Amino acid sequence: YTRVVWCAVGPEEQKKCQQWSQQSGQNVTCATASTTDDCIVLVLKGEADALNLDGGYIYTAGKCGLVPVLAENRKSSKHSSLDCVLRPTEGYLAVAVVKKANEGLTWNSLKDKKSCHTAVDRTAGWNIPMGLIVNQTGSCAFDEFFSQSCAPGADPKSRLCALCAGDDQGLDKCVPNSKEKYYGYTGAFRCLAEDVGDVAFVKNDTVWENTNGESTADWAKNLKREDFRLLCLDGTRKPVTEAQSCHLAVAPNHAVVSRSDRAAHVEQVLLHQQALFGKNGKNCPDKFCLFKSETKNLLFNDNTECLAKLGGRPTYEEYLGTEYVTAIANLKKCSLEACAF
Ligand SMILES: *[C@@H]1O[C@H](CO)[C@@H](O[C@@H]2O[C@H](CO)[C@@H](O)[C@H](O)[C@H]2NC(C)=O)[C@H](O)[C@H]1NC(C)=O
Ligand SMILES: *[C@@H]1O[C@H](CO)[C@@H](O[C@@H]2O[C@H](CO)[C@@H](O)[C@H](O)[C@H]2NC(C)=O)[C@H](O)[C@H]1NC(C)=O
Ligand SMILES: *[C@@H]1O[C@H](CO)[C@@H](O[C@@H]2O[C@H](CO)[C@@H](O)[C@H](O)[C@H]2NC(C)=O)[C@H](O)[C@H]1NC(C)=O
Ligand SMILES: O=c1ccc2ccccc2o1
Ligand SMILES: [Fe+3]
Ligand SMILES: [Zn+2]
Ligand SMILES: [Zn+2]
Structure with a gap:
């Protein structure tokens, strides 16, 4: 009850x-x-x-x-006077992250590169980045844009799952749940951190939380922020301290x-x-x-x-905002109003 x-x-x-x-x-x-x-x-x-x-x-x-x-x-420096339960939400920053040592890789040279996504249908891991890529390439063939990827939830036999690892045993490859090694904000960044992929679509917080000692997880222990760079839409590359001016979109909170x-x-x-x-x-x-x-x-x-x-x-719709709902709607027309089940 x-x-x-x-x-x-x-x-x-x-x-x-x-x-x-x-x-x-x-x-x-x-x-x-x-x-x-x-x-x-x-x-x-x-x-x-x-x-x-x-x-x-x-x-x-x-x-x-x-x-x-x-x-x-999450925490804010603004509205801090107001209690957490009544404070408006701020939305998170969807960013594209690369290794600094991978010199010359920018938003405009992503074709045929290796990518890491949180999971198919997610905000920062898929909807925003793939939405921008379809718009820019005038094509719905987002399954042919990267050479290889780990995008939990796509066809296991397909190249969008080629880079996924499954669990301790290799079982469950590409499942959109945490049994898959490279699933979610953390799995996608790990996919990049271990150099399996060249780019990872996560949020800003993920980089800060998994570097400079904030994690202690074996694969993140030695990760330094200065070894990472965000790709901005203007073809430029910036330190991760500059996400406010170098993000793909601001996203509604979970x-x-x-x-x-x-x-x-x-x-x-x-x-x-x-x-x-x-x-x-x-x-x-x-x-x-x-x-x-x-x-x-x-x-x-x-x-x-x-x-x-x-x-x-x-x-x-009011919660997601008209911006984000049109981006998803347009992206979905690549794969008509009803409940998907
Ligand atoms: C489970 O929920 C009930 C209901 O809120 C809790 O029992 C209440 O207990 C409070 C204080 O302990 C009482 O003042 C209320 O009268 C009770 N409410 C109701 C509707 O029965 C209970 O404490 C909760 N248990 C746990 C472990 O979370
Ligand atoms: C991809 O392109 C579409 C089409 O231009 C963008 O969708 C439109 O969204 C803008 C607002 O950002 C509106 O002004 C247009 O009128 C919308 N059009 C349609 C047909 O819905 C879409 O936002 C772009 N996707 C991304 C991720 O930026
Ligand atoms: C990017 O995200 C990080 C969080 O992962 C934000 O930095 C946090 O800022 C709060 C203050 O609002 C601090 O209390 C935390 O210590 C910071 N986290 C870390 C791990 O450094 C950062 O300000 C965000 N930036 C943008 C532009 O959105
Ligand atoms: O998606 C959203 C989330 C918050 C919000 C606040 C005011 C007006 C429009 C809004 O849209
Ligand atoms: Fe999200
Ligand atoms: Zn913005
Ligand atoms: Zn309303």
Whole structure:
């Protein structure tokens, strides 16, 4: 009843969800699926209530009637006077990242290079970059633009999965969940950091969080920011300290979605759940912290300060903005109004 069923994507989020379920006293329980799409379906069926989603998936989900309930909010130097739950969200910066030692690689010389994407249909990992590339090349053959890629969720036999690695055993190659080594903001940057690919489409935060000692994960230990460069749209290259003037787009924050008829309930539970396991929650550090997963961004991004109320009770289009919705719409016409399932 006042119990919420969260949808976890893959084995690792399932384990974090079970831990959460346990500390919550069954106030939250877990459903598990192998992909975000599957989790969206469980929610439509009513077999699950909510899950946190990147903007690209919010678009899929909105067409099927799901609604944004609360958004992820990270720290700001602005609006700091206002409490986290009521502070407007800022949006994140979608950037293209390369290794400095790879001299001469710019936005205009990306053809036939190797790329790393968070996952097919995601904001920074796919929608924005591929949207710009289709626009620029006057072509829908984005499957022929890079020689090889790791783009979780595409055909495993195809070149968009050639660079993906699967799990500890080589199983699950290219699955759009964390079992795939190079999945998500972290996997895509690792794909670049190990030199598997030449470019990685992630957000600004990912570079700062995985360099200069911020990570301790074996592959990130020795990563220095000065060994990285962002590709700007003007053909230029800049240090990662200049993302405000060298980004592909500003993107809406990841947000929690639910079916419209369960929204008020999910919202109420979440606010109480974060009072308990959020940033300064009563039980967070001591027992369990919703927003940590040792750099793996499980269920929520690890840099989340809190989940924030929306205000303006936005529909999913109002939430994503007309800009981003037209970019996705135009990109989708390369692969007609209905719920994808
Ligand atoms: C599960 O949710 C219920 C409901 O919010 C919590 O029980 C409430 O407990 C508070 C304070 O402990 C009481 O003041 C309220 O009257 C109760 N609310 C309801 C609707 O019963 C309970 O503490 C939560 N359990 C956990 C572990 O999160
Ligand atoms: C790709 O090109 C399309 C078409 O020009 C861009 O989509 C349009 O978006 C702009 C706003 O940015 C509107 O002024 C146009 O009228 C829109 N057109 C259509 C047909 O929808 C799209 O934004 C570009 N994609 C990216 C990622 O920049
Ligand atoms: C790019 O993202 C980083 C976060 O990954 C932003 O820097 C953080 O800024 C806050 C203050 O608002 C600090 O408390 C953190 O310590 C910073 N993080 C790190 C790891 O350095 C940065 O300002 C963002 N820039 C743009 C242009 O959006
Ligand atoms: O997608 C968005 C997100 C926030 C916002 C605020 C004011 C006006 C339009 C907006 O669109
Ligand atoms: Fe995202
Ligand atoms: Zn901009
Ligand atoms: Zn509105």
